[PDB]
Homo-oligomer: 226 residues x 3
DNA sequence: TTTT
DNA sequence: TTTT
DNA sequence: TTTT
């Protein structure tokens, strides 16, 4: 099976660990053994002019996933929304009410349907590829999330006297001479990881530590040596 | 305390990772320090003629657990159903509605009661040993589950041009010349493991990797060198 | 950020692994990098005369947290009750009705409000420090919990003809010549740990293993 | 309720 | 539904 | 709500 998935993750935090805005939207191609991705795309947001509430992310995600899918022709696209695996081209007012989600979730998706359903429909017509709202269940979506963490740190290195990056849940990053490696901290996930080439700037220091206000989320903090 | 527990686990998957049927039912004796089992029984199902909605699994589990219990005389039997630890001999329509479980769960157990309650009652009459529906809370149940994973792999090695075995949640297997070792991938469980003797066939290769459709579950795939 | 948090944890178990009563209430000061605590206080309960339904735990916790806070002057106090981070000084029946929790949870806290809310208000007046009900989301709270586990083992060392101590969730302890080290078993938490100096008595054996009745909780067993 |  |  |  060959899967394209997408996710948005990584946030700039203020000094009291409150998120300001999100950083990276990433689409990944994932193939057996489903532990990493070697082909991916990134779109960076502007975290300082981001509306955290909300849902530009999912629109950016589906667009980027389709863009990558047109190049690599996967079997399926996984979208990061836990709706039971329903095909997005089949999302209408009727099918959304039948969904086992909260009443806010239903109204959010009734609005999102207006743009996303025709998009998925046109893409399925062209290719036969479904876009499914699978979310938390998907390993490719979790690999996309790890890459969103990595690219958030890349963005921070490229855009830093100090920056706090809130990473996606329970993942770590490691800085190497010419690359950033991201890994899940959950061994139950079976060793999921990512790697992105980058040049690491001089004159800065970094540390990774637990976000004290959000258990199981880590903070990557960059500080200037000057 | 000395505990007998049982579980059914391991599934044949098709090439799109959809389960076809379950493989192994295992009963274990677990004693201090409650990390493994040295005395156990296995019953193999036929996964290609399995009713995944049938729920023959729990009938097989209680039967195999009672069979092992008659040999080793434990303090208690742990059954894999998370009902709050109620004794199975006490399961009637009255006690089932009082349980804090789903209405689907209540309707399943009202039907299961008709066979299982008399079975547990007669075993308690004979021995004084309770069969309790403890499920997810039980470490002996998790150890039975790990052994079901190991035995599913043994079954696959013995019955394979290629096979996909979906393992129980977050566990790995290791193949040695003369045995299979199974371990939980969750360090929070305190190091649960199992080991089964077997002959490993020639002319085949194997791989263990994440199920892309079911996060925190692994696939053990066997392929012929053919 | 500088944080005081508190928790009650660790339990005496009987021979069928049933809890009898809780042991340690611990207040910790937590600072960057938020992985441990070097400054903490402990209050021991009497586990053989403990009411597990009583919610004396949270009253002991807030008192000890305040006691430590007066000494180390933190930015905020984290209380181990998952109410979304609401300020305790702002807890009246109306705000409790609005909380996204169970109806039992609501009835418990309407009763707790009667004593704890005036305490938080007066403390906020004195220092400007909030006491927020953040609970499961707080790392300092988990560090307090790990320290409760450590102190429960210290209690066991101090009181052992044989004892079974049920530790807080997924943590381990190690006894060294002059200290007890506690660690989270969950690597997702990022390496949380604690350490307490104590004199280790002679003539004893100990073992750590899974509670067979409560998955992901360990038992510390000590014998003379 | 259980199963991957 | 999603975000730290 | 919390506890093993
Ligand atoms: Mg995500
Ligand atoms: Mg606690």
């Amino acid at each position: 099976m060959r899967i394209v998935a997408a996710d948005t993750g990584g946030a700039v935090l203020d000094e009291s660990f409150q998120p300001v805005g999100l950083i990276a939207t990433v689409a990944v191609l994932v193939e057996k053994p489903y532990k990493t991705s070697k082909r991916f795309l990134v779109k960076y947001a502007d975290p300082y002019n981001y509306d955290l509430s909300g849902r530009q992310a999912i629109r950016d995600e589906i667009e980027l996933a389709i863009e990558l899918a047109r190049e690599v022709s996967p079997d399926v696209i996984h979208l990061n929304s836990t709706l039971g695996g329903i095909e997005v081209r089949k999302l209408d007012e009727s099918t959304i009410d039948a969904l086992q989600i909260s009443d806010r979730g239903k109204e959010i998706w009734k609005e999102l349907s207006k743009d996303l359903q025709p998009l998925a429909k046109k893409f399925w017509e062209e290719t036969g590829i479904e876009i499914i709202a699978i979310g938390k269940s998907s390993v490719p979506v979790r690999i996309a999330e790890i890459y969103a963490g990595i690219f958030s740190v890349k963005w921070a290195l490229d855009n830093v006297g100090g920056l706090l990056v809130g990473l996606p849940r329970y993942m770590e990053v490691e800085i190497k001479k010419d690359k950033i490696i991201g890994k899940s901290l959950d061994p139950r996930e079976g060793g999921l990881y990512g790697e992105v080439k980058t040049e690491v700037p001089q004159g800065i220091k970094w540390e990774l530590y637990p976000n004290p206000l959000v258990r199981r989320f880590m903070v990557f903090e960059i500080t200037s040596k000057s």
